[PDB]
Design a protein around this ligand. Structure first.
Ligand SMILES: OC[C@H]1O[C@@H](O)[C@H](O)[C@@H](O)[C@@H]1O
Length: 441
């Protein structure tokens, strides 16, 4: 029942999804500033120009974190605030903001976890080739060094990347997210340079070696289940798992790409230099796990011989299936396959239609049911030997949900985007009790 003494209960956000002040204090343009100017790309023509106006209101948000009793808070750093342009010079005002944020967290006994890259690449980096260019791994490492040198001993947990797979799939295969390319053959190349940037960032971290600080990476996964017990379906499920869930994990832990990856991207070995794989697979301090839903697959006659079968119920407002057993299986599978390493669930959460009632309360019993089941599955994984050190709710605040804009609300705290007024939902109240009790009712 009760989690371990000192278990780190938290909530998470990302810079572009909450900060606003998109052009203030010397901040540079990011690929998402640019992307949200293009008509038709975002529902309702929404953008992150203002978002939760967190850059201006962070002290209020710091107080909200204290109100919930968070032991930890996960955010991302906007690279374009730190290095607005191709001169690579550090913008001191951008840096001051994260210094102030982190100082406020320690003031309130909240341990900081910072994600260096949560998708808002500076436009200047994109003009130098973006993730297609190998040199971007070096720009990322320089950016990392600056941030770790400045805040290393103030930030005990560092994540290099959030969900490199989504940057590949949504950013380059589908054109759904920035930078908006639609060429499948570019995937392997991008993936390699994302991995390489992580490796070079971790080197920079070890060189600085800040006291009491650790560094890792966050990956997303969708637990794969075959739609039937038929051998073709099992085989499609196995290949889908290798690709969807181990494209990054395998080279990170084992130092090599798996077969399903090399077959999906035949030209991949062309970007791999002689010590890349060693750099990529150097020891991380912990793994960040993001999870929302499973994927159910069947075999297909047409390439690539895999079909994802859509589920109609039970789902969230995103249409994503609700299956807590999927989180438990993912955690058990990682721990069995790669060994018992430290894991933080860095995002787990759900979107539902939220509407303040006449009295202004925001009651979201379906979000409470989602968290109840998932935190319960996490506790079972811990009981079964998974080294789980923390759990972060996605998200602290309703925010800019990428291509869905503001039409999707993931927050435990409701945000009225007209007034910037924040309201604890029923789920935040509930979660506060979980933290106080250090476990479920
Ligand atoms: O779609 C829900 C959430 O998914 C996670 O993959 C991303 O890291 C978040 O930025 C996003 O809001």
């Amino acid at each position: 029942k009760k989690f371990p003494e000192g278990f780190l209960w938290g909530a998470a956000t990302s810079s572009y999804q909450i900060e606003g002040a998109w052009n203030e204090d010397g901040k540079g343009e990011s690929i998402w500033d640019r992307f949200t100017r293009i008509p038709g790309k975002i529902k309702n023509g929404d953008s992150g120009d203002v978002a939760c106006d967190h850059y201006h209101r962070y002290e209020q948000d710091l107080d909200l974190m204290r109100q919930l009793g968070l032991k930890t808070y996960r955010f991302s750093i906007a690279w374009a605030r730190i290095q607005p342009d191709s001169s690579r010079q550090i913008n001191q005002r951008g840096l001051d903001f994260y210094r102030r944020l982190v100082e406020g967290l320690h003031k309130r006994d909240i341990l900081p976890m910072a994600t260096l890259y949560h998708w808002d690449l500076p436009q200047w980096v994109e003009d130098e080739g973006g993730w297609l260019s190998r040199e971007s791994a070096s720009r990322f490492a320089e950016y990392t060094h600056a941030l770790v040198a400045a805040l290393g001993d103030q930030i005990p947990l560092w994540v290099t990347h959030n969900e490199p797979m989504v940057t590949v799939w949504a950013g380059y295969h589908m054109g759904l997210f920035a930078p908006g390319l639609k060429d499948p053959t570019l995937g392997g190349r991008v993936a390699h340079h994302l991995l390489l940037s992580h490796g070079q960032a971790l080197q920079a971290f070890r060189a600085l070696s800040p006291a009491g600080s650790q560094m890792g990476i966050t990956l997303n996964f969708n637990t794969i289940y075959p739609v039937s017990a038929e051998p073709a379906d099992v085989e499609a499920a196995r290949r889908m798992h290798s690709f969807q869930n181990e494209l990054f994990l395998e080279p990170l832990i084992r130092g090599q790409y798996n077969q399903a990856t090399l077959m999906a991207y035949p030209n991949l070995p062309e970007f791999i230099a002689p010590e890349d794989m060693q750099t990529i697979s150097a020891p991380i301090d912990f793994l960040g796990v993001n999870y929302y839903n499973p994927m159910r697959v069947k075999s297909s006659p047409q390439p690539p011989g895999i079909e994802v079968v859509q589920v109609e119920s039970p789902v969230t407002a995103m249409g994503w299936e609700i299956a807590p057993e999927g989180l438990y299986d993912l955690l058990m599978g990682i721990t069995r396959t790669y060994g018992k390493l430290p894991i933080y669930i860095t995002e787990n959460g759900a979107a539902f239609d939220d509407q303040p009632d006449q009295s202004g309360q925001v009651n979201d019993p379906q979000r409470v049911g989602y968290f109840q089941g998932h935190i319960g599955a996490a506790r079972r994984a811990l009981a079964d030997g998974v080294d789980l050190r923390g759990y972060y709710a996605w998200s602290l605040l309703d925010n800019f949900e990428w291509a869905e804009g503001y039409s999707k609300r993931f927050g435990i705290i409701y945000v009225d985007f007209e007034t910037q007024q924040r309201t604890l939902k029923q789920s935040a109240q509930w979660y506060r009790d979980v933290i106080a009790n250090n476990g479920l009712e």
